[PDB]
Design goal:
- The complex is a heterodimer of chains A (about 300) and B (about 120).
- Chain A contains nine helices and nine strands.
- Chain A has about 300 residues and is an alpha+beta fold.
- Chain A has a single domain, classed as Transferase(Phosphotransferase) domain 1 (Transferase(Phosphotransferase), domain 1), CATH 1.10.510.10.
- In chain A, the strands form two sheets. Chain A has a six-stranded antiparallel beta sheet, with helices on one face.
- In chain A, a hairpin with a 2-residue loop joins strand 1 and strand 2.
- Chain B has about 120 residues and is mostly beta strands.
- Chain B has no helices and twelve strands.
- In chain B, a hairpin with a 3-residue loop joins strand 4 and strand 5.
- In chain B, about 35% of the residues are buried.
- Classes of the chains: A alpha+beta (about 300), B mainly beta (about 120).
- The interface between A and B is medium-sized, with 16 and 16 residues.
- Bound molecules: Gefitinib (IRE) (2 copies).
- One Gefitinib (IRE) binds next to helix 1 and helix 4 of chain A.
- Chain A: Belongs to the protein kinase superfamily. Ser/Thr protein kinase family.
- Chain A: It comes from Homo sapiens.
- Chain A: It is found in: Cytoplasm, Perinuclear region; Golgi apparatus, trans-Golgi network; Cell junction, Focal adhesion; Cytoplasmic vesicle, Clathrin-coated vesicle.
- Chain A: This is Cyclin-G-associated kinase.
């Protein structure tokens, strides 16, 4: 049992980790809180037991991505990883161990625990998120997260935001072409819908006859929805109406005076055509000018959430 | 749950001198908790100093205090202790005891709830 794994001591290189708690249940791979008996340092440990080579190469690519993104203040710090051959495993299930730094918890958790959020709070939250994405798009080749939601935003022990789950990421861009046959468009949409959830789908992955590019601009749409959620406490496409996503039909609260400064960014990130959406660099620049004109350091720890 | 931690034993101490901190616990199971001492150094913030396993099988310290400090515990009385020796001016701070350990670069998991005890390493 994945729950009876608590109390076990896992050896990972020089580390001898005691499994203390269950942090998350993903069905395929639990996430545990682990503590080294030789140093006392605590970690988060992801453990995959699977034979399916699709999940295996997924977590292998997941590891390589984190090593590339290591050292960034807004991305969760990679520690170590190891895999055990199916032949040599204890249960005869191929074992993969993924170890990263331990955070305080999910942003969502520390959100509902605390009237509404001030503009300075939303500014720090969103800016530190966009810095993480910016660092991913800066790589060679660029890294596209594709699974950007508030559930994947963590709050560090320092009080800053850390982006965490990179299992869905990719470095391949897809450009629907004249040479794309009618059934190729059909097969691709199936593959996307089986790996996605309605409310998080983008216009470019719903209509595959629009010839919209499917790449980096996906994240900007996701960031656009995040900023909306941070302000108005709801997803702009929560109900999952695919008719409203493709047509970009959402509604900013009519008489909202509190988050007026963010209306320009929301409208500019939620553009149906990816080629009309702001780049990640343009997003950061506008945020920095908002922070400068509000006398706020956007990289500073968010004490309100602590 | 209610967590009640209370530190004491600090005060004005001289460089190269010694001191002995203590902490009482209640409202949780002290026998099922990795216990740590953390300090709040002025101009630096919070940092992890020392830690001990729930069964005292392992004791951990930060590099700047190894060999000089000694942590211990008594589960029967729910008491945590820190024996400090060869105190340097850098050891000056506000000391707390917390549950669980740390992450990354000596950054504590649990951010103090108690008032803590003051430790001042001064040459009078
Ligand atoms: C103490 O709180 C956490 C610290 C964490 N520190 C680091 N990483 C986390 N998640 C995570 C995410 C993806 C990964 F690949 C790995 Cl290795 C770890 C963490 C998740 C944590 O909590 C998980 C949140 C899932 N909760 C579980 C309870 O119900 C609401 C959903
Ligand atoms: C939220 O997750 C996704 C979003 C996606 N969003 C857009 N496109 C995807 N794939 C894709 C693949 C081929 C194509 F030609 C095109 Cl156009 C798109 C996506 C794939 C996604 O998941 C791919 C598989 C990720 N899992 C992670 C762990 O389990 C095994 C692999």
């Amino acid at each position: 049992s994945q729950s009876d794994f608590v109390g076990q001591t896992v050896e990972l290189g020089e580390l001898r980790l005691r499994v203390r708690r269950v942090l998350a249940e993903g069905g395929f791979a639990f996430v545990y809180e682990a503590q080294d008996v030789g140093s006392g340092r605590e970690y988060a440990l992801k453990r995959l037991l699977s034979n399916e080579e699709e999940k295996n190469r997924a977590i292998i690519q997941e590891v390589c991505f984190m090593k590339k993104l290591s050292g960034h203040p807004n991305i969760v710090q990679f520690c170590s990883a190891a895999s055990i051959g199916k032949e040599e495993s204890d249960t005869g299930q191929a074992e993969f161990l993924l170890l990263t730094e331990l955070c305080k918890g999910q942003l969502v958790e520390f959100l509902k625990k605390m009237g509404p959020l001030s503009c300075d709070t939303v500014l720090k939250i969103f800016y530190q998120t966009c810095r993480a994405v910016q660092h991913m798009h800066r790589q060679k080749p660029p890294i596209i997260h594709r699974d950007l939601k508030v559930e994947n935003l963590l709050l560090s022990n320092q009080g800053t935001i850390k982006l965490c789950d990179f299992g869905s990421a990719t470095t391949i861009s897809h450009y629907p072409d004249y040479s794309w046959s009618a059934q190729r468009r059909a097969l691709v949409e199936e593959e996307i819908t089986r790996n996605t959830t309605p409310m998080y789908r983008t216009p470019e992955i719903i209509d595959l006859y629009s010839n919209f590019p499917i790449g980096e601009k996906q994240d900007i749409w996701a960031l656009g929805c995040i900023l909306y959620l941070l302000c108005f406490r709801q997803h702009p496409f929560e109900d999952g109406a695919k008719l409203r996503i493709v047509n970009g039909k959402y509604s900013i609260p009519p008489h909202d005076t509190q988050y007026t400064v963010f209306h320009s960014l929301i409208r500019a990130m939620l553009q149906v055509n990816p080629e009309e959406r702001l780049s990640i660099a343009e997003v950061v620049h506008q945020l920095q000018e908002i922070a400068a004109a509000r006398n706020v350091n956007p990289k500073s720890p968010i004490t309100e959430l602590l | 749950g209610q967590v009640q931690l209370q530190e004491s034993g600090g005060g004005l101490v001289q460089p190269g001198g010694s001191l002995r901190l203590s902490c009482s616990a209640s409202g949780f199971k002290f026998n099922d908790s990795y216990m740590s001492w953390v300090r709040r150094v002025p101009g630096k913030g919070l940092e992890w100093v020392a830690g001990i396993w729930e069964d005292s099988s392992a004791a951990h310290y930060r590099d700047s205090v190894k060999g000089r400090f000694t942590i211990s515990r008594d589960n029967a009385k729910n008491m945590l202790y820190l024996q400090m020796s060869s105190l340097k001016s850098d050891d000056t701070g506000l000391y707390y005891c917390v549950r669980r350990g740390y992450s990354g670069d000596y950054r504590p998991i649990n951010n103090p709830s108690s008032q803590g005890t003051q430790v001042t390493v001064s040459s009078a």
